[PDB]
Design a protein around this nucleic acid. Structure first.
Lengths: 101, 219, 214, 203, 102, 48
RNA sequence: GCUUUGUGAAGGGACCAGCUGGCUGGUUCCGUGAGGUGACUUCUGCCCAGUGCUCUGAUUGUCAAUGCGAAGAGAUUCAGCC
RNA sequence: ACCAAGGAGUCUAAGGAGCUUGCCAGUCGGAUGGCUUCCAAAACCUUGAGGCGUGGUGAAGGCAACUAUCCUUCCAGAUGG
RNA sequence: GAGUAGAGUGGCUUGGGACUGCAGUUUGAAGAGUGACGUGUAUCCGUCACAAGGUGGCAUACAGACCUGGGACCGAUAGUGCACAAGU
RNA sequence: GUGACCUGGCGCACAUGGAAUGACCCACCGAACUUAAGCAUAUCACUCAGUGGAGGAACAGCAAGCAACCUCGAUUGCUGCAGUAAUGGCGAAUGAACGAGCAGGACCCACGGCUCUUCCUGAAAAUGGGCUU
């Protein structure tokens, strides 16, 4: 038990009676997997111009947006939460984060 | 116990689950699945033939959003329409609604105008797709009914309407590319999130601060 | 279903459980053991054994595709044991007028004219009473497998070709691998009708030909 | 109304009026037998709201249940096995005295059907309940739809099966939702259903 | 994994919807006071009187000792809420007694 | 099932008759609300 | 045979799961329920410190639950007495 | 003592590490749903929630993987120019 | 909808943990509200429901016994103890 | 003047109940072997045995419910949640529920998912009743 299962035999942490998990459900995606979710006709007609395509993450099943991966052109991302890295990268690329129920 | 690295068993079969000579067992084998599929199909079509010139399901159910934060966006069918949706559609008698094939649920209310409007227009496309047969076969005949709608009563398999989920799977459809708004340029969404989360944590502190401020104001 | 106890040591017999009681032959006899007469088997067969097997749909569809390709290659139809003496082409395609066939006589007329009634006659001749204890359990005969008629829809050709001994019937809408490759063996004679043939790749959702090494 | 005033009189049970009356009644219950047929319900309001009618199909029976917990019937208090099951005196019945009383009356009157019961009195030695029973083969009962459901062969010995109100009480069926989790459709049915080993055709 | 923390929608003040004001139904008449039933109950109280613990509460409130009466009611009823309500009832009964006397 | 069953064997054979009828076809009552009157007036005219 | 022992009946012993239950007991100290020793004869000595049993007021110590008091916003805490 | 017949590593839930096959940021989906004398309780179908995977870390409050031409660095190292 | 709900305490039960449920006993409400909102308490606020009465079909279980259809099952030391005048 | 009620009884008449049933069900009662490499809480197990009662099903059932959501809307069964939250000499082990997807929401039940009592009304629901026909 010591060699193959160290952390056995103990008790650690705050125990949470009636642990609800639906209010904690939060699938995350990344900035690297955003521009795949835009029909590249929009990605092409919006490249240098001012308009930015809109990415609704809830449509695909992601709640939070994590900020790993570079972004090529600014897009508008609707989601339920963002990291400050994701916000920073989107804002610098040009787009905007939107908090959506 | 293994002489290896396999995980800790956690087997959970300590209580006579096995149908041996001494025990009856706790085993249920679902060998009826194959035959019961066909039997369910047969009794379903017997239900149709019984309540023939009517939807095979039969009551119009409302469309309600699934419950939790995890399934907010997913819509589905309800148990019955709210009496507010009925009154908005034009029905003020729940028992008559039920007799003509609209399901009622007085337990439900509309917590918002969107559900009200959605189920109201649902009932209004119903009651127009609906051909009521007249009682006693030859008295008054309602509007729209053309005297051969009664000659040709057709039992549809699904209720005209789209899928139940196709009402959240339309609200989850982004717009066209747009210009930014200057508030969408200035707004810091992460700062907003952290602010509104620190808000619920600094409550008693944001009372002790006022108390100290006013004590020092006195002094 | 016995109250058998072990006699223990101090008695000149083995220590197997033995029938309690007396006054009959069964008394004292060993019970409760695979080794014993009238005693339970070893590990009695349970009814919650895995009887069915799970194959992914992609793999089942690939099996169907491959069975059809092997049906198209005729150096395997004859290898599986069909007579391609009178068979003009492989795969065998047939006008849709046969889907409106009502008589087994017209079915055999068609099969003769195309060159599969040799297989049907082989099956009918070699039909025999099943060898070895299968004939006792409601499997009376051992019938070989002849041509496979694949029709486009539910039609009269089913009742037409039904009685012909080796012939099986099937539809492109649901192609049964137990019929396209019976025994696990490949290269069975299939006699598709014209619309079934035209709908084969549409149903199976085959868009391209594969680039296979040579 | 009259039944409201009766209800509140009987709600203030420690009052001197109700104490006097209940004391006389306790005396006469002690000097009666253990199962007596009433000619009419004490607590007219209570029996009326439980479902009594003054039609000839209904009957009231009084019955006493000796107070106290349950002593398990082990000779000389010797409970073999382990110290846990080695307890004798501080045990308490699973059923409650109301359903025990209903059971006694229903076993004594086998051809009747037990609808509700109600506490009428309690002294040092016994608790007294009154049980409403219905004759299922009476024309009045069989005719009146509101009680006609009692005449169906599924309603035999509801007291014996725990279908009465006291039974629903001790079966955990007062509450529903998260306070009656492992209660429906039965404790043993629930236990079976979640201790079942389900073997689908494909697993 | 998939269950990371997330602020709630109305904490992020998003409001994907427009709420309808919670209406009034026939069910929350059960909240409104019942004057006829209160008359019935006051009559029955007038008739049958009070329980021994209610009398002891009134006798404590006479000498003062309202905290002692509250503790008594708490021991008898189990709940501080019920104890406060019963002490309110008994205070009002004692006030009725004194008023009727003077 | 170990004795005469001199009444339960009869009720079981009756149940068997009923079961091997309902296996052939679901039951159809000969007289129902929609044919009582017709049958009765036919009987009346025929015997009168 | 001897000798202790409990018992005057709302009692001694004692069964029963339970009982307004059955037993000793159709009894009542010359009766009896519980021990020990072992006819007659001759004796049965000293020790109540230990353990046991028993008596007192158990007036001084320890000692439960309930109850009564105090403080607390309350859960609760603390004192004294039986 | 002798001979004959029987006679003992089995099935199941979960799992481990190889091997095979299919698909791929997906995969599976035979709970269920559509069809069609016996065969067929089969075969076929994508209505499918969801399971596993795509993110981890903190007891928790929670937070969440830099890099705008491309590319983490070093040592050994398969190919190839 | 009152000896009820609840509370002290005891005991069983539950994953339910300052006690999920039940039961004895003592106690015992409100109804100018009550119950639940999974950490005991006090203070505010909110949401949902309206206990202590009752009916109530459907999808559900079904190793017996009867009526059927089947089987990669056993094949007289096997398969039920019994293929037979076997619970003899 | 020798009654009217109440409360009990005896006889008669017309009826229910009783007993049985190798599966399922409802209510109780209730072990130990075993496991923990010993054993006592734990486990087997709220199981076996025991008692009582059935029906073709039984039980449950149109919220003093779930949830905290953009809410839902009887119960039941399945999928799954989930071997998770939680319990446990925090050891051996034990261990749900809701969300969600379904079947069902035709039928021999229904005031088509309610109703009794409370509450309102009220000369018992109105041309006496009974036996034969």
């Amino acid at each position: 038990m010591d060699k193959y299962h160290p952390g056995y035999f103990g008790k650690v942490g705050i125990r949470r009676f009636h642990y609800r998990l639906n209010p904690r459900f939060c699938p995350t995606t990344s900035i690297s997997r955003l521009l795949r979710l835009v029909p590249k006709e929009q990605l092409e007609a919006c490249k240098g111009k001012e308009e930015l395509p809109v990415v609704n993450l809830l449509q695909h099943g992601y709640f939070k947006l994590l900020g790993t991966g570079r972004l090529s052109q600014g897009v508008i991302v609707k989601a339920r939460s963002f990291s400050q890295g994701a916000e920073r990268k989107i804002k610098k690329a040009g787009g905007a984060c939107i908090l959506v129920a | 116990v293994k002489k290896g690295n396999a995980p800790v068993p956690n087997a959970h079969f300590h209580k006579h689950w096995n149908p041996t000579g001494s025990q009856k067992g706790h085993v249920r084998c679902f060998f009826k699945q194959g035959p019961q599929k066909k039997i369910r199909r047969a009794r379903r079509q017997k239900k149709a033939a019984a309540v023939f010139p009517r939807p095979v399901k039969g009551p119009l159910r409302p469309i309600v959003h699934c419950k939790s934060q995890r399934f907010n966006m997913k819509t589905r069918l309800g148990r019955g329409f709210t009496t507010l949706e009925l009154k908005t559609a034009g029905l003020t008698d729940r028992r008559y609604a039920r007799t003509i094939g609209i399901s009622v649920d007085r337990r439900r209310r509309n917590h918002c105008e969107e559900s009200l409007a959605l189920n109201a227009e649902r009932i209004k496309t119903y009651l127009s797709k609906l051909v009521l047969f007249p009682l006693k076969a030859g008295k008054k005949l309602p509007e729209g009914v053309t005297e051969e709608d009664i000659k040709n009563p057709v039992q549809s398999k699904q209720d005209g309407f789209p899928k139940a989920s196709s009402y959240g799977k339309n609200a989850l459809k982004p717009e066209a590319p747009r210009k930014l708004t200057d508030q969408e340029k200035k707004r810091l969404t992460f700062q907003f999130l952290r602010k509104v989360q620190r808000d619920t944590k600094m409550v008693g502190k944001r009372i002790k601060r006022k108390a100290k401020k006013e004590a020092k104001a006195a002094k | 279903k016995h109250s058998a106890e072990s006699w223990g040591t101090g008695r000149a017999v083995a220590r197997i459980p033995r029938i309690s009681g007396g006054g009959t032959h069964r008394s004292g006899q060993g019970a409760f053991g695979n080794m014993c007469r009238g005693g339970r088997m070893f590990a009695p067969t349970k009814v919650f054994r895995k009887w069915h097997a799970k194959v992914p749909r992609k793999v089942r569809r690939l099996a169907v595709r491959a069975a059809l390709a092997a049906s198209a290659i005729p150096a395997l139809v004859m290898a599986r044991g069909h007579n391609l003496e009178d068979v003009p082409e492989i795969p065998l395609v047939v006008p849709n007028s046969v889907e409106a066939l009502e008589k087994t006589k017209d079915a055999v007329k068609l099969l003769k004219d195309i060159g599969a009634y040799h297989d049907v006659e082989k099956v009918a001749a070699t039909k025999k009473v099943r060898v070895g204890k299968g004939k006792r359990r409601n499997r009376r005969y051992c019938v070989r497998k002849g041509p496979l008629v694949v029709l486009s829809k539910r039609c009269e050709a089913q009742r037409a070709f039904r009685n012909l001994p080796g012939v099986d019937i099937n539809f492109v809408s649901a192609l049964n691998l137990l019929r396209l490759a019976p025994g696990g063996h490949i290269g069975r004679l299939i006699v598709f009708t014209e619309d079934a043939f035209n709908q084969l790749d549409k149903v199976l959702k085959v868009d391209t030909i594969e680039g296979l090494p040579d | 109304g009259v039944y409201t005033y009766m209800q509140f009189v009987w709600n203030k049970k420690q009052s001197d009026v109700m104490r006097f009356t209940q004391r006389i009644r306790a005396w006469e219950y002690r000097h009666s037998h253990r199962m007596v047929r009433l000619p009419r319900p004490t607590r007219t309001d209570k029996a009326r709201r439980l479902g009594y009618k003054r039609k000839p199909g209904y009957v009231i029976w009084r019955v006493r249940v000796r107070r106290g917990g349950r002593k398990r019937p082990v000779p000389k208090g010797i409970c073999y096995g382990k110290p846990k099951t080695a307890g004798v005196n501080h045990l308490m019945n699973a059923k409650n005295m109301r359903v025990i009383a209903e059971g006694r009356v229903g076993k004594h009157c086998g051809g009747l059907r037990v609808l509700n019961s109600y506490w009428v009195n309690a002294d040092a030695i016994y608790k007294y309940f009154e049980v409403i029973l219905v004759d299922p083969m009476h024309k009045a009962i069989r005719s009146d739809p509101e009680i006609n459901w009692i005449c169906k062969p599924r309603q035999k010995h509801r007291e014996a099966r725990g279908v009465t109100s006291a039974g629903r009480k001790h079966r955990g069926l007062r509450h529903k939702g998260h306070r009656a989790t492992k209660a429906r459709p039965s404790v043993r049915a629930n236990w079976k259903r979640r201790n079942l080993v389900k073997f689908w055709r494909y697993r | 994994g998939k269950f990371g923390a997330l602020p709630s929608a109305k904490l992020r003040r998003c409001s994907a919807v427009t709420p309808l004001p919670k209406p009034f139904r026939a069910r929350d008449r059960i909240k409104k006071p019942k004057k006829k039933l209160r008359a019935v109950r006051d009559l029955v109280q007038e008739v049958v009187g009070f329980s021994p613990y209610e009398r002891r509460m009134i006798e404590l409130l006479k000498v003062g000792r309202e905290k002692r009466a509250l503790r008594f009611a708490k021991r008898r009823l189990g709940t501080h809420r019920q104890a406060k309500k019963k002490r309110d009832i008994m205070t009002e009964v004692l006030r009725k007694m004194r008023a009727a006397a003077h | 099932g170990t004795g005469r069953m001199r009444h339960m064997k009869n009720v079981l054979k009756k149940a068997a008759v009923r079961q091997r009828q309902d296996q052939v076809a679901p039951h159809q009552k000969r007289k129902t609300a929609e044919n009582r009157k017709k049958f009765a007036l036919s009987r009346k005219t025929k015997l009168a």
